[PDB]
Design a protein that fits this description.
The radius of gyration is 14 Å and the shape is globular. By secondary structure, it is an alpha+beta fold. The strands form two sheets. A four-stranded antiparallel β-sheet has the order 2-1-3-4, covered by helices on one side. The chain has a three-stranded antiparallel β-sheet with strand order 6-5-7. It has helices at residues 18-25, 86-95, 108-111; strands at 2-6, 13-15, 34-41, 56-58, 64-68, 80-83, 97-102. It is 17% helix and 27% strand. The protein folds into two domains: 1-63, Alpha-Beta Plaits (2-Layer Sandwich), CATH 3.30.70; 64-126, Alpha-Beta Plaits, CATH 3.30.70.2050.
């Protein structure tokens, strides 16, 4: 489950699909800025919008994000698995994930590429 609370908006955007709702936070939020996003850690992008099972309750905005390089919409529809435990997100990367970065460190360059051609991460800094 995922929900984003927008600044200026009296109502948060909430859905079961984490990957979907978090996508809205990364684009369709042009209506009102994302103040903070809360997510019910349930696989999110590891699974489908149906999700495996109940896990952690966390604020994705203040948590770890892994953007999948091996399996995800790098040039398409990228999904993010937000997790409270970094090491879990890193394990996801070992399997398929690309980079583990906090939502406070989310760059458009890592979530989506023009092509790839050996592109730089958050700022070629990490």
């Amino acid at each position: 489950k995922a929900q984003i609370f927008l600044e200026g908006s009296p109502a948060p955007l909430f859905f079961s699909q984490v990957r979907d709702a978090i996508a809205y936070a990364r684009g369709p939020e042009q209506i009102a800025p994302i103040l903070v996003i809360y997510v019910n850690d349930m696989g999110a992008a590891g699974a489908t919008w149906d999700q495996p099972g109940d896990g952690n309750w966390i604020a994705a905005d203040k948590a770890f994000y892994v953007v999948g390089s091996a399996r995800r919409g790098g040039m398409g529809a990228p999904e993010a698995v937000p997790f409270s435990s970094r090491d879990e997100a890193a394990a996801f990367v070992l399997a398929e994930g690309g980079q583990v970065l906090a939502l406070a460190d989310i760059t458009d360059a890592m979530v989506l590429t023009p092509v790839e051609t050996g592109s730089e991460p958050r700022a070629d800094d990490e």
